[PDB]
């Protein structure tokens, strides 16, 4: 079994394409796997739950092993300690999405600006050729 899933339909992830379960509009972390349009029953199930936005460097994380070492011995403090650890894990899923959305926005803006420069260059070159023809025609 792999640790992370690698085959995602990126049109579905960004939002241009509908999912395999259109009734679900905002998948949960454990619902992403079965909402993927490229779902297959032959692929082995990953051993951990990650969203499509997670980086490939998360395969070396072991969070519950560290939690046990930090476990307080007083049950009253232990319950609150565990509650904050679960809060930390859930928030980490939505930090990845925010970074994912900001990172893609910068790449899109760069590409759009580059196209704008090329279009103006072609228009100016075409006009210059037309201007030259006018002078040549008039001798």
């Amino acid at each position: 079994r792999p640790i992370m899933h690698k085959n995602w339909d990126w049109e579905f992830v960004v939002g241009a394409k509908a999912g395999r379960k259109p009734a679900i509009q905002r998948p949960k972390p454990h619902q992403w796997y079965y909402c993927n349009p490229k779902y297959s029953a032959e692929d082995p199930l990953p051993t951990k739950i990650f969203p499509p936005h997670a980086p490939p460097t998360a395969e070396s994380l072991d969070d519950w092993a560290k939690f046990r070492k930090l476990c307080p011995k007083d049950p009253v403090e232990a319950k609150k300690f565990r509650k904050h650890f679960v809060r930390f894990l859930n928030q980490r899923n939505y930090d990845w999405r925010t970074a994912f959305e900001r990172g893609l926005a910068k790449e899109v803006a760069v590409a759009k600006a580059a196209q704008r420069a090329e279009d103006e260059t072609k228009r100016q070159e075409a006009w210059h050729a037309y201007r030259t023809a006018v002078f040549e025609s008039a001798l």
Binding site: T57, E59, S60, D62
Partner: protein, 483 residues
Amino acid sequence: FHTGVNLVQPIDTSKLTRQIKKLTLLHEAALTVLQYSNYCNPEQATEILRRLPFLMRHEESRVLKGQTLDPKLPPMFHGLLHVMGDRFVQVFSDCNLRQIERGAWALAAARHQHDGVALALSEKLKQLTQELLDLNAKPFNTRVTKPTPEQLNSGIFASRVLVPESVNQLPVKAVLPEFNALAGIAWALATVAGEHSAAAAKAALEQLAEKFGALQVDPKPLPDADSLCRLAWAFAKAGVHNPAAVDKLFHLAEERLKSQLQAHDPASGPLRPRCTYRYKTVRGWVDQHFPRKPRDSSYLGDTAPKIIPRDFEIDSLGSLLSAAALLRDQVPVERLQTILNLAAQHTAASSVAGGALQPLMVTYEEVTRVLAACEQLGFRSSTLVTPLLHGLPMAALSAEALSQLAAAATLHHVRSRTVYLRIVRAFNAKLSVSPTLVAGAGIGAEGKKEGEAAAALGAQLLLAVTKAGLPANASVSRIASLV
């Protein structure tokens, strides 16, 4: 004031500082380095260099039990050092003494050779040699209130928050207060020196050796054991020939070892080194000579001290003695013998509490490093080896290592039945049958030994035991029968 589009710099200084302090992976470091390496001031450029050696070790430890390190990382680690090395040279003229220490150490620690840095360090070492070895020299002061125009070029004061600084009262009667700073820089110059910068590095070090030898005073706080080792290896690597300087350096090491033993009372407990205990404070950090009690803070999550050793330890004795073997010809025999005896006394006293033996844990790498120096120096002593064997675990060692250890103990005339039994018992449990004897692998050696190789290891162990004179036991009898 810093709102809008900056036509000169792509990233604001304050934001760049935030990213540097927020680094935990090499990929994140590569993202920052490959984009804004040309806009870092000396404070930012040197901070990245110090972190990189630690980030490389962290990733090697992130690998789980059944995984392996990504092969693309080590090439990237050296790629980032080279890029930062170039920027270090560009801003080298605006660094402080402390900043130069950070940048030089990072490259030397990573064993990355850079001609540009070596040439820059060579000129700096010459300038600092005549200033830091002067008798009328003052310690470096971090309490700056109104910086000079040249201090504004270091980038320390371009901050929107409080700048941490040491709160200690600087000594006013210290001799050569910055000797440790000079020793580290010289060692880095030797290590970072390349093929085209070797001549310049050697010339600068030779002048330092002559100045060091022609000195009639000793620093009031004696140089740390780590600094002494670094300076000794700076001469050894560079090939500097100066018996006067070499002898003086070993004299300081001898003096420090005696002082530690003189001021030790065995009734208190096993010998331990003197260290500097650094704690976090409101305005920065404070250094103490003795530890505090454990404390619970309402705001800090960690109140533990940073321990910076000053006296010698087994780790440093294996590096100082290594340098001595390289520089044997330049050291009088009398001084070498005195240091060797002091080293044995330091080891014996560090693992004894009250009237009973209390072994101190050591690793196999450390033991081999110490023994290798002794073999080169031809020093045989049972008071230095016996403490090392008691504190050495013998559960994960290969069969070959156990055989070598038994031979070493016999040659050093170690007389302890417990040590011999712990070795033969471990060796017997690793010698398996099938009709071919197989010797298991382990930390000590790579691979397994089968057939004659296993028999040879058994014969050597039996020969060592027979010379030692151990009474017959089950473990030895089984080994003899198999071999």
